[PDB]
Each structure stands twice: as structure tokens, then as C-alpha cells.
Design a protein around this ligand. Structure first.
Ligand SMILES: *[C@H]1O[C@H](CO)[C@@H](O)[C@H](O)[C@H]1NC(C)=O
Ligand SMILES: [Ca+2]
Length: 496
């Protein structure tokens, strides 16, 4: 469960946020597989509530109505077709599992579902599963509002409604069975793992009970005895009753301190400088590397809905974003997840986006298909950060240096640092307010290397910058503080 279950070599997964099943299937064959991506995290594939006020927000997908594979991304057949085509190409699929709750208790009863299933939140009656009033913690919670009021109370945080979402009683074998039945369906279809949404709101023991009823990965693509990869969404920063270590027994956990910290350092906020990254990792209070799932930003905190706050770097800050992601992909700590999102009309009104709810590109509710431009970029407002040369080439970098030790670190004491990975890769950063010109020991074999940030290597020709490594692994690097991308990266596979 700690093993991603990706093909040998592939070291990253990408979140194709709100993408359609059919677009993902194509992307797997036309780009993800060839560019070395390890897998894809998909948006919840089960039926959810169709919220029309605001108009189809992205967060409506976190309010389940049933476990039918019927959403705006596609139906069961399209979902199945996607898993098969991606697996057949070596790209794994990880599902965002919303098993801690159902829909809002204040939501109106009826058939406003992505699949037309009937539901009645008022009477806790979800016939498509089926679930009834006896399957919720309505009588287990103590709070006056029935919702979580005090996060210093681990109990109410687990038994009370998270912002009004109907809280399922995961202690009952019936509920655990219904959920496991849904998860086994996905496993048998071919998924390699799951993201356990809102894990902090579930008892570590209830989760384990559910994982105990899960089948092994499909023997057609995975070796016998393979267990699904498990990463739990636990927002744990500092001094909270619930520690992420409490979930180490079920699988990996999302390390939200990673992106929050990296964001302030790159932004150079409150005295932080890149030279401090010398001991990045557990040395900064992070969970053990072998239990961490890291990222710069996620669908939640990229729009202010998650931990990290204002220090979080997103595609909106392209220049600084690329460096942060470049640094994360080059550093050996944890398992990396790349973000892929869409553009929305950010309407900041007194320091808060009033349009952070806006859903994916759409035509009257119907999600717009992902178009590819001649320059390999996406249209229809899909950002496709994963298609950015600087990001995609760093994804490949991590694969190439997989297993190599962190070495040859250098820093000017401010914001000019560099380090290598064994003898397979080397990266240089310039985040200071002045040019960088110095000869450094890369620890790489002599030869001409293409800088994979400014360009690419194609049939023995570099389309960008070229670095020359001496017989003693030394090479000269020049980075202006005015450069489009103030960092250079070279590896064994970019050598001419
Ligand atoms: C790189 O490509 C060009 C043609 O586009 C060719 O003339 C040149 O010889 C190539 N160099 C190498 C080293 O293959
Ligand atoms: Ca709960």
C-alpha cells in the first residue's frame, strides 16, 4: 500500500483535475506514456449531487449521492475504457475516494444527481447505495450544530459533520462493506490505488477495517499479491490533536507542510532563503520520506481552500511555480505529484477570490474537451502544467536520477544553490537579485549536455542552452536574475 505500483522507472503521478475519462485515455497514449509519467489521479468517479447555485461548482464532486460510476467526466463504460487503455500503456490510475461522507445535510431531496439517482439528505435516505438514517453518525456527534466546531477535539472531528456533510458511520460493518464493494469494483476494473479524501475525519481503525476487505490488484496488469497504493488526505501542520503518523499503518499520507514551506522559501518570505534547503525533508519536521506524498499545490489550496495559505505557489505565478516544481522533482524526498488544472476568472475582492467555486471549462454544465495546440499546449482554458517543457522535462529528470543520492550541494549563503543526484543529474538555481556566474562540480561524466529547462535534446541536437562538463565533472553555469527561467538542469539522458 506504500508502493505506488507504477511501471519501473516512472516516479510521478499527475492530477488531471476534472478531466473527462475520454480525454485522459487519449492523454495516456499520446503523452503520459511517452513522456514517462507514472500515473494519473482522477476526480471522484462516483455519482455526486448536481449543485446549480453556484452553477456546477468543482466541490460538488465531493458530495456523493451513490457509488455509480456516473459523473460529468463520463459513465462506467468510459471510465472502464480509460483504465484499460492507460494500463495497457503503462500509466496507472488512482481514484479519489470520497468515503467519509455523503452530501450536505441541508441539500434538497430529489433527483439533482449526476446520474438521476434519488436522494433525501433530510431523512438520510440514499436508496441508490442504499443507506439510511441508521448508517450515519447523527446520534454519535455531540456538538450543538451537529458539525465539527472544535478541531482540538479528535472525537468530534471524526464523528461530526465536516461543514454539514452527512457523516457515515464507518464503524458499522454494513457501511464498511458497501464502501469496500465500491472500491473492489474499481480495483477489479484496473485501478492501482486510492486517495483517501478527508482521512483526518475518519478513525485510522475504521479505514483499516475497510482496507481489509479489498481485493488484490488485477492480475492482468499487476503481479499476484499486489496491494492497492494508498495515500490518505490528512492536513497536519503543527500542534493538532490528530497526527499524520496515526495513519502510517494504512499507507502513505499527504504532506501539506511540503508545499507550504517551499512556497515561502521561494517567495523569500519571513527570512527564508534557498540556502536553507540544504537539509530539506525530514529535517524540516516532515513525515518519513517513505510515507510521504508531496506536491507544491493541489486542487484545494491552489484556490485558497486548503492548507498552506497565501504562500502556496500555483500556475498563476508561473515563474516561481516552475522553480518550486523543479526543485521538488529533483529532490529525492517522498513521492511526487504534479498538478494539472484549468483557468477560472479569479475575482479577488478584499483578499479573497469570490470565484474560487467556478467549475471546469464547460458549455452549460457540459465539460469542455481538452484540445491540443500545435505547440503541444492545451486550449479550452485547460492549463496543462504537465505539458510545460520545464515541468515535463523535470518529470523525466526524476525518473533518470531515481535512486541516486543527494550530493554536490552548493549555496552562496543567500538564494543561489545547486546540487546533484549521484552521477545522473545536476540542477542549478538562481533566486537572488543578481546574476549567477560560477564553475561548479557537477559530479557528472565529461561531455556536452542539453539544459532540459530552456530546451530539449533531439537527435543529437539541443534546442536550448548547452552545458559543457570537463573531465573533472566541472562545468560553468550562467544564470541572469532576469532570465525567463532562473534555473538549469542536466542529466544522463540529456547528454549528446
Ligand atoms: C541536428 O539536426 C540537423 C537537421 O535538423 C542536422 O543537420 C544536424 O547534423 C543534426 N545534428 C546531429 C548531431 O545529429
Ligand atoms: Ca467522519
Amino acid at each position: 500500500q506504500y508502493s505506488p505500483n507504477t511501471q519501473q522507472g516512472r516516479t510521478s503521478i499527475v492530477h488531471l483535475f476534472e478531466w473527462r475519462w475520454v480525454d485522459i485515455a487519449l492523454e495516456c497514449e499520446r503523452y503520459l506514456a511517452p513522456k514517462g509519467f507514472g500515473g494519473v489521479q482522477v476526480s471522484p468517479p462516483n455519482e455526486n449531487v448536481a449543485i446549480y447555485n453556484p452553477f456546477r461548482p468543482w466541490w460538488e464532486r465531493y458530495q456523493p449521492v451513490s457509488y455509480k460510476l456516473c459523473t460529468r467526466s463520463g459513465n462506467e463504460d468510459e471510465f472502464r475504457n480509460m483504465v484499460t487503455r492507460c494500463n495497457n500503456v503503462g500509466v496507472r490510475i488512482y481514484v479519489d475516494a470520497v468515503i467519509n461522507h455523503m452530501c450536505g445535510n441541508a441539500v434538497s431531496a430529489g433527483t439533482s444527481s449526476t446520474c438521476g439517482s434519488y436522494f433525501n439528505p433530510g431523512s438520510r435516505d440514499f436508496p441508490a447505495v442504499p443507506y439510511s438514517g441508521w448508517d450515519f453518525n447523527d446520534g454519535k456527534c455531540k456538538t450543538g450544530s451537529g458539525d465539527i466546531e472544535n478541531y482540538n477535539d479528535a472525537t468530534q472531528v471524526r464523528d461530526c459533520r465536516l461543514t454539514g456533510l452527512l457523516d457515515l458511520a464507518l464503524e458499522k460493518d454494513y457501511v464498511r462493506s458497501k464502501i469496500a464493494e465500491y472500491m473492489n469494483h474499481l480495483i477489479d476494473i484496473g485501478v492501482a490505488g486510492f486517495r483517501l479524501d478527508a482521512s483526518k475525519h475518519m478513525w485510522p481503525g475504521d479505514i483499516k477495517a475497510i482496507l481489509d476487505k479489498l481485493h488484490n490488484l488485477n492480475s492482468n496488469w499487476f503481479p499476484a499479491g499486489s496491494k492497492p497504493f494508498i495515500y490518505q488526505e490528512v492536513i497536519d501542520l503543527g500542534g493538532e490533536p490528530i497526527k499524520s503518523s496515526d495513519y502510517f499503518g494504512n499507507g502513505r499520507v499527504t504532506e501539506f507542510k511540503y508545499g507550504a514551506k517551499l512556497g515561502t522559501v521561494i517567495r523569500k518570505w519571513n527570512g527564508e532563503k534557498m540556502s536553507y534547503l540544504k537539509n530539506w525533508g525530514e529535517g524540516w519536521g516532515f513525515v518519513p520520506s517513505d510515507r510521504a506524498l508531496v506536491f507544491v499545490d493541489n486542487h484545494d489550496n491552489q484556490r485558497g481552500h486548503g492548507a498552506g495559505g497565501a504562500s502556496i505557489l500555483t500556475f498563476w505565478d508561473a515563474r516561481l511555480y516552475k522553480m518550486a516544481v523543479g526543485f521538488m522533482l529533483a529532490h529525492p524526498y517522498g513521492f511526487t505529484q504534479v498538478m494539472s488544472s484549468y483557468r477560472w476568472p479569479r475575482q479577488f475582492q478584499n483578499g479573497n477570490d469570490v470565484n474560487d467555486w467556478v467549475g471546469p471549462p464547460n458549455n452549460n454544465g457540459v465539460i469542455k474537451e481538452v484540445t491540443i495546440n500545435p505547440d503541444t499546449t492545451c486550449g479550452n482554458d485547460w492549463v496543462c502544467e504537465h505539458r510545460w517543457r520545464q515541468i515535463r522535462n523535470m518529470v523525466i529528470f526524476r525518473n533518470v536520477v531515481d535512486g541516486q543520492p543527494f550530493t554536490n550541494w552548493y549555496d552562496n549563503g543567500s538564494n543561489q544553490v545547486a546540487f546533484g543526484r549521484g552521477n545522473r543529474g545536476f540542477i542549478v538555481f538562481n533566486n537572488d537579485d543578481w546574476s549567477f556566474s560560477l564553475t561548479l562540480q557537477t559530479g557528472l561524466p565529461a561531455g556536452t549536455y542539453c539544459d532540459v529547462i530552456s530546451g530539449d535534446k533531439i537527435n543529437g541536437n539541443c534546442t536550448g542552452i548547452k552545458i559543457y562538463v570537463s573531465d573533472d565533472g566541472k562545468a560553468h553555469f550562467s544564470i541572469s536574475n532576469s532570465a525567463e527561467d532562473p534555473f538549469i538542469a542536466i542529466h544522463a539522458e540529456s547528454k549528446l
